[PDB]
Amino acid sequence: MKHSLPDLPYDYGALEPHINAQIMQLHHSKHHAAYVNNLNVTEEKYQEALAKGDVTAQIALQPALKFNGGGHINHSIFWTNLSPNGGGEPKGELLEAIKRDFGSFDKFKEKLTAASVGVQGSGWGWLGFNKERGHLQIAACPNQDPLQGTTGLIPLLGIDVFEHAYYLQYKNVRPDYLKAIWNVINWENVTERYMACKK
Amino acid sequence: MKHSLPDLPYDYGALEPHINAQIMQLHHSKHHAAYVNNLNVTEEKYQEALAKGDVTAQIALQPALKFNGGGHINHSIFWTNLSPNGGGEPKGELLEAIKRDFGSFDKFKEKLTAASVGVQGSGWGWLGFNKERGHLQIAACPNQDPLQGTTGLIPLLGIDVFEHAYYLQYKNVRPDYLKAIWNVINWENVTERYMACKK
Amino acid sequence: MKHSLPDLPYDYGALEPHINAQIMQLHHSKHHAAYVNNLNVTEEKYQEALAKGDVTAQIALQPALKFNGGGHINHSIFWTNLSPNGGGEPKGELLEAIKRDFGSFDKFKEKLTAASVGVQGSGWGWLGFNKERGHLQIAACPNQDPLQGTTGLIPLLGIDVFEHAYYLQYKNVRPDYLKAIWNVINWENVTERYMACKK
Amino acid sequence: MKHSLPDLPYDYGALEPHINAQIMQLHHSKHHAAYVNNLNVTEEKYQEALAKGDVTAQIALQPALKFNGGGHINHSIFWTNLSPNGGGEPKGELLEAIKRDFGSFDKFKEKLTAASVGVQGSGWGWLGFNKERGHLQIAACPNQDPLQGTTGLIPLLGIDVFEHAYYLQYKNVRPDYLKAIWNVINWENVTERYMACKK
Ligand SMILES: [K+]
Ligand SMILES: [K+]
Ligand SMILES: [Mn+2]
Ligand SMILES: [Mn+2]
Ligand SMILES: [Mn+2]
Ligand SMILES: [Mn+2]
C-alpha cells in the first residue's frame, strides 16, 4: 500500500489574492509531491530494516520518516483546511467550543496567530482537539512534526509557516500572510474534523 | 554596548546571476536587521533577569537569544564569505588542508553540499576548524544555532539554507542554489579565517 | 544575585519510608547544591559575556544555564511539594478543580503517574496551572527544563524522575516510586500555589 | 526478527571492584532486558502501522523505538567493551591511531572522560571511527541515541553515563566512575572493532 499525492480540491488560483497561484502550484506539485515520494521510499527502507532486525538502520531513517511523513500528514490536512468558500467564522458546536475554550473567536485567532508567528525556523501552528480533556487546544510544532503523532492532539486546523508557504508573496512579513489566510479558512472542513472527535 | 547591523561589503546586485538583488536586499536589510534588533532587546531583558536572579526569565529568553543571536553571528560571517570577486578554488595552506582532510577540493564541495542539502527545515551547512584536533571539519546546524557556540568549531565558511536565502530565485530546488553559490565564495575571506586559527 | 541552596523544610529522613533518608540527603546536599554552585558560576560567565557582547559565549553557556538553573528552580519547588504531614487528598477549590479537569482525584493520579513514568531518560512530571485557559494541566519536561520557563504553565506539583530521585531505594522500578510518593504530597503547599494563580 | 537479551561475556561480579556486581546484574537483567522487551513490542506495532499506512502511528512510536532500540544497540556493544581481563593500554595500530589523533593515550582518556562527564542528563560518551575521514573521533550522545544511527560514526568504545550505570556505587560522583572504568576496558574488543573499520 503506497501513499499518494491527493489532488488539490480547487484551482491553483482559487485562493487569490490571499495566497497566490504560484505558491499554491509550487506548494502542492513540488513540495507535497516530494514529501509523498520520499515517504514511500523511507517506508520501504524501514520495512527492509525491520525484516532484518537492523535497528541502527531504523533509527537512521527516523528523521526522513518524520519530516516527509509529517509533511504528507500536515499538507494533506492543510489543503482541506483552505477553500475559496472559506473565511468568516465557524458556526454551531465548533463556534461554541471556541468561545468556551478561548473566550471569543477573535481571542482564538490571536492565540493561533501568536503560535504561528512564534515559530522560529520552520514549523506549523495548530488548532487541535484534546481527546482526554474533551476540549480544544492550540500547539505549535517544529519542522514537519505532525500534531497527532507528537502530541496526541487531533488536528482541526493547521497553518504552515515554512517560508515556502508565503515568501514569494509576503517575503519576510509572515504576519501579513497570517492576516490573509483567515480569509480562506475552510470552516466547513474544520467543523467536520471537530464533530468527528465527539461521539 | 549594542550590536549593530554591518553594512554589506558589496552592492545588492553584485552576486548576480548567482544570488539575485532582491534576495540580497531582503536578506540583509530585513532578515539580518531583525536579528540584530531582536538580539539587542533580548540581551537587555537578559541583563534585567540576571540582575534580579530571575532564572525562569533567563531560560524563557533562551530560544530568542539563540535564534536572533545566532542569526546575527551567522549572517555577519555569511556576508564576508561571499564576494563578487569570489569563486574558483582557495590557494596556499587552506587548499592544502582541504586536500589533506577531504581528499580533494571537489570532494570537499560534495561533502559541504551534502550537509547543506541534508538540512531538513531551516539551518546552515558549515566548514569549520576543530582547534583541538587541528584540522578542518564539516557540520550542519539547525535553525540559527551558531557553529562555535554549539559545537566549539571555528567558522570558516557557512551556507545559509533557510528558504529565504534562495526561494525567490530557485524556488524549491535548493540544489540549484548550492550549485550557484560556489561561484561567489570569497576564498580570500575563508583563508583569512583559517590562518587566524593557526599560530 | 548569588543563589543559595534553600534549607529543607524538614530533616532528610522525614519522608520515610516512601523516600528514604539517603536519597533525600544526596538529592539536597549533593545534587541541588551542585545546581546552585554551577548556576552561580554560569551566571557570572554570562555577566562577563553580556558586558563584552560575546554572543557565542552566551549561547555556549545556555545548556549549563538551563540544566543547573532549571535544577535550582525545579528542586526548590519539589522540596516544598513534599511533607512528613502530607499524603491523602486536597480539599476545597483545588480538589474541585482536579475533579473538574481530570474527572476524579484517582484519574488525576493516573494521568500524572503516566506522564512521569513515561519520561524516557531524565526529566520531570508536572501538574501546572494554565493561566491563559484558567485550568489545570499536566505536562512532562525533559532533563531539568523548568515548567514555567519552557511552557508558561505555573508549577503546582512536580515529580522528579531523574534516576537519582529514586534509584537507591526502588532501583529500576520507577512505578513503585510513583506509587509511594503520593503518601508525602504536601497538598497544603500545592493548594497555596494554586490559590496564588487565581485573582 | 525477535531481538534477544545477549548473554553477558562474564558473570555479574567480574568487573569488581570498578563496577560492582549489583549494578551489573541490574543493568543487564533489568535495564537491558526492558530495552529488548520494549523494542520487540514497538517493532510489532511498527509492522502493523506500515501494513496500514498509518504514518501518525509510525511517528508516535519513534521515541520508544529510538530509546529502547538505541538501548539495545548501545548496551550490546557496552558489555563487549568491558572485561575482567581488561584495563591497561591498547597496542599496535589502535594505539598508534590514538596517539596520532589525540596526542597520547593519556590525552585521549582526558577527552573521553570530559565528553562523558559533560553529558547533562542521561547519555553516552563514545570513541568512534569516522569512515569518511579515516580517523578516530569522540562524540557524546543524548539518552540512548545510538552512535552509528545518529552520527554515522562506527562505535569502538562506549561509556554509559545514565545514572543507573554508576549511582548505586559512586552516587553523584560520576568522575570517580569514569576513573574506575578504565581498569576494565576490553582493549582486545575495541581493537577488533577498530580493525574491522579498515580494509
Ligand atoms: K503520610
Ligand atoms: K584490570
Ligand atoms: Mn509546506
Ligand atoms: Mn538567512
Ligand atoms: Mn533531582
Ligand atoms: Mn545503561
Author numbering:
A (entry chain A), B (entry chain A), C (entry chain B), D (entry chain B): 0 to 198
Question: Can I see the authors' text?
Answer:
Human manganese superoxide dismutase (MnSOD) is a crucial oxidoreductase that maintains the vitality of mitochondria by converting superoxide (O2●−) to molecular oxygen (O2) and hydrogen peroxide (H2O2) with proton-coupled electron transfers (PCETs). Human MnSOD has evolved to be highly product inhibited to limit the formation of H2O2, a freely diffusible oxidant and signaling molecule. The hydrogen bond network extends from WAT1 to outer-sphere residues Gln143, Tyr34, another solvent molecule denoted as WAT2, His30, and Tyr166 from the neighboring subunit.
Of particular interest is the Trp161Phe variant that decreases k2 by more than two orders of magnitude compared to wildtype, leading to exclusive use of the product-inhibited pathway as k2 « k3. From the cryocooled neutron structure of Trp161Phe Mn2+SOD, it is apparent that the Gln143-WAT1 hydrogen bonding interaction is perturbed compared to wildtype Mn2+SOD and may be the primary cause of the observed kinetic effects. The bulky Trp161 residue likely constrains Gln143 and WAT1 to form a SSHB for proton transfers. For the Trp161Phe reduced resting state, both chains have the same structure, and WAT1 is forming a hydrogen bond with the amide anion form of Gln143. For Trp161Phe Mn2+SOD, the protonation states of Tyr34, His30, and Tyr166 resemble those of the wildtype Mn2+SOD though there are notable structural features. Besides Tyr34, the other notable structural feature is the hydroxyl proton of Tyr166 that points away from His30.
